[PDB]
């Protein structure tokens, strides 16, 4: 019925108003790629735009831009009425006026900087009373046509004249400020945004339906993550993208009030939220007002916590009130708050990955003008511990550095510079490099949950263990039907043992990469220092974090350091089991089987590994990684020399047959020494840029073997008899 | 356009008023090493000084001393208008008077201790209403000429007579106290001072520009270090070297 209704959701094209439909839709609605379409919304208003051909979007959805989302007064998830408009349009006169809320501080002829290089080669349609956003000059202003030929009958054409007036019109309350934060202002958190939408917008957008059904709405969403990850930004965006009254409660602001006055503020906020329609209560920095009652001094703080608990428990389904909270220290929150009925849904806003931080960089530089040498992908790759706030600071510092070199072209005597020079100031890649040079990443110490970049091409040889790892990891996560057909529960653990430098870490990272699963690396020294504070909850948090990242691989590297804390199995007579290892075994035994978490351990001291690790059900897949043989050495050398300009005369198989007991690390050291000799040759010749055969010969002259023959024999002995271990 | 505007920043010569320019500038402005130059600032006031030949300073910058920085009522990062003055000058009478805010506790003939071994072998120019600083006697006092021949038409010469009056004049609010802490009162922290300048003075000196751009200013500067390292001194200096209202907590 009525094949003209479209579901409204945010678009992905980072441009002006351009709607995107699915493959069957443009054929069903007989419109082509470059066609003019008409959008009809509520409150008797229209919008005109140009469609885009998309296939991999969805089965039935339109894509709606935020620029003209407010033009139709429609929010996310709304239903729109489309209509093809095969009417030829051409503009003759379009009286256009900005709004004096975002154009303050800009002078001069704004057309040649903002409107001229935005109209041509676009051919966009303009309707009566359209508010379209134009970026440029390191700021964004929205623009408004107020008078033209009868609506719409207008497209962007070179034959359209324009004239400035110099008196921008004020903004009325009928429209929402486009300068406010929306869904498009958040980068690197789309899964979290999807969860928040699914848990929030349906009850809020349809309060009557949710009241009619009589089902429990999630009213205890709790955002948490490292500081500066955009928790407040996400909450404000969710508030703005829905027609829900938003009441903001600040932790420190409440705590700064006098005793007996903060409780009044909390009660007033909850009363306002209950009274005013569906509403969202956001309590930023929840740990400020509600820490653990076991660790708190004053009775006023405990009164505050009890009042918050009472207010949370006094929430009814009929109230249609959703309480959201943000905290960078989730473990400091009082446990009574995180129970059922108060804060049950927990959303982890983690550190963005490379793609996410690239998206954040684009979001923060979309206002700025970038020089042609600016490679935002390179900047994202070079920033590891940065968060959204860190990237915003980096972009601001780059802009300030660009200004600092433009103090002469900009008349500092002049009160308010004009935009014809501001756009001429462009941020170079050198400015970004300088800003990145002096920047302090806040999330350096945070554990990384990400898909590693190293693939099988970075590993030479080891084909059999590659196949075994594929069968152990990919198959249970890709074909569960075969496993339940044959009745075998997949093994959840693998232990890597062998001589050092043979690729135990690379194998785990590569198998994580191939499955496209999250990878968490916990090293033995890290465990030994993180337990020295007697914090038993940290290694539990590691397993909890791995649980939410399923499918995930939890890799414990350098287990020898853990096993060497108390000497080993024999040692002086005592056992090496202490501290973390018992809790690690407990966590391994207490993890759900249906969860897709895979645990991999690595050690180059199989003699001192404690037997309880090897028990079936914890780590029973014993995989032995030996020293590379002749062909594996060739493969390792080729893998290590992918990034270097190796000369043609270099015989890699000759080097492989000249090295017998060398491991992968030894071959990497040989390659690095040869490259360093080449660098020295280049430096000397400066006062040629191809690493040669002679460099490899000289490096091989000083090449050293890092595994003894007796060590090889002992590893071969353990390669055959390690399942025994446990028992005596 | 107008090859006469100079960017004002602190000098490195630890002496009286001596301006320092870059290598191309004295050739571009046809002035030599020992030449008399005229400095013109805001609020319709002038200053006269002697240039210095420098090469490894910068590409385009003048070097401005704190003694006569307040003489032009110009702060750090300001734009000044220079002019060569190939006019022969010689002083005949210069009625000079100290200021009774820094000369208290000093008696006797202050000329033979302060002004006599400061004038000769220098040949410095003096303008109308100049406040120049003289150090000596384990204290520093600033000095003020109030009456002389028409401005400036005066350089330091042995043929210039002087007479004491014994009644120093009070200091008005039009000028800033040179006894206050400035950038030259901090030693051993130039990288930190450079960072503080880059993070502070541009937003403060150009608030309208920073409001027009709509970019984030660093507003949370936190100084830290061992006690007695001059954190308070640095903060007060940054306050004084910029025309920003300073509130101390
Ligand atoms: N994911 C993101 N996408 C875009 N901008 C971001 C993102 N995360 C942070 N920012 C920027 O960094 C600023 C700081 O983020 P906030 O949300 O205010 O910090 P926070 O998440 O509340 O963490 P706190 O308050 O320090 S515990 C935001 O106002 C944005 O400008
Ligand atoms: N099969 C391999 N192919 C290519 N490089 C390898 C290989 N095995 C080891 N390497 C090199 O050796 C380095 C160390 O790799 P790892 O996986 O950490 O070895 P390991 O078995 O874990 O022993 P350690 O204690 O970590 S050196 C890698 O960064 C490579 O440079
Ligand atoms: N770098 C410096 N250059 C010149 N004088 C300095 C310097 N550091 C300290 N002083 C002198 O030592 C005095 C004491 O320095 P203050 O700035 O008052 O101490 P502080 O830096 O505030 O550290 P506190 O107050 O003990 S935590 C200053 O008033 C100066 O006279
Ligand atoms: Mg917050
Ligand atoms: Mg390793
Ligand atoms: Mg102090």
Swiss-Prot record, chain B:
Annotated positions binding ATP 1: 227-233
Impact after mutating residue 135 to S: In IBMPFD1; impaired autophagic function
Consequence of changing residue 178 to W: In IBMPFD1; increased ATPase activity; impaired autophagic function
Effect of mutating residue 231 to Q: Impairs ERAD degradation of HMGCR and does not inhibit interaction with RHBDD1
Phenotype for residue 140 to T: In IBMPFD1; uncertain significance
Location in the cell: Cytoplasm, Cytosol; Endoplasmic reticulum; Nucleus; Cytoplasm, Stress granule
Protein origin, superkingdom: Eukaryota
Modified residues (Phosphoserine): 17
Reported modifications of this chain: Phosphorylated by tyrosine kinases in response to T-cell antigen receptor activation. Phosphorylated in mitotic cells.
Role of this protein: Necessary for the fragmentation of Golgi stacks during mitosis and for their reassembly after mitosis. Involved in the formation of the transitional endoplasmic reticulum (tER). The transfer of membranes from the endoplasmic reticulum to the Golgi apparatus occurs via 50-70 nm transition vesicles which derive from part-rough, part-smooth transitional elements of the endoplasmic reticulum (tER). Vesicle budding from the tER is an ATP-dependent process.
Family: Belongs to the AAA ATPase family.
Domain topic, free-text comment: The PIM (PUB-interaction motif) motif mediates interaction with the PUB domain of RNF31.
Complex and partners: Homohexamer. Forms a ring-shaped particle of 12.5 nm diameter, that displays 6-fold radial symmetry. Part of a ternary complex containing STX5A, NSFL1C and VCP. NSFL1C forms a homotrimer that binds to one end of a VCP homohexamer. The complex binds to membranes enriched in phosphatidylethanolamine-containing lipids and promotes Golgi membrane fusion. Binds to a heterodimer of NPLOC4 and UFD1, binding to this heterodimer inhibits Golgi-membrane fusion. Interaction with VCIP135 leads to dissociation of the complex via ATP hydrolysis by VCP.
Pathological association: Inclusion body myopathy with early-onset Paget disease with or without frontotemporal dementia 1: An autosomal dominant disease characterized by disabling muscle weakness clinically resembling to limb girdle muscular dystrophy, osteolytic bone lesions consistent with Paget disease, and premature frontotemporal dementia. Clinical features show incomplete penetrance. Frontotemporal dementia and/or amyotrophic lateral sclerosis 6: A neurodegenerative disorder characterized by frontotemporal dementia and/or amyotrophic lateral sclerosis in affected individuals. There is high intrafamilial variation. Frontotemporal dementia (FTD) is characterized by frontal and temporal lobe atrophy associated with neuronal loss, gliosis, and dementia. Patients exhibit progressive changes in social, behavioral, and/or language function.
Protein name: Transitional endoplasmic reticulum ATPase
Organism of provenance: Homo sapiens (Human)
Full-sequence range covered: 21 to 269 of 806
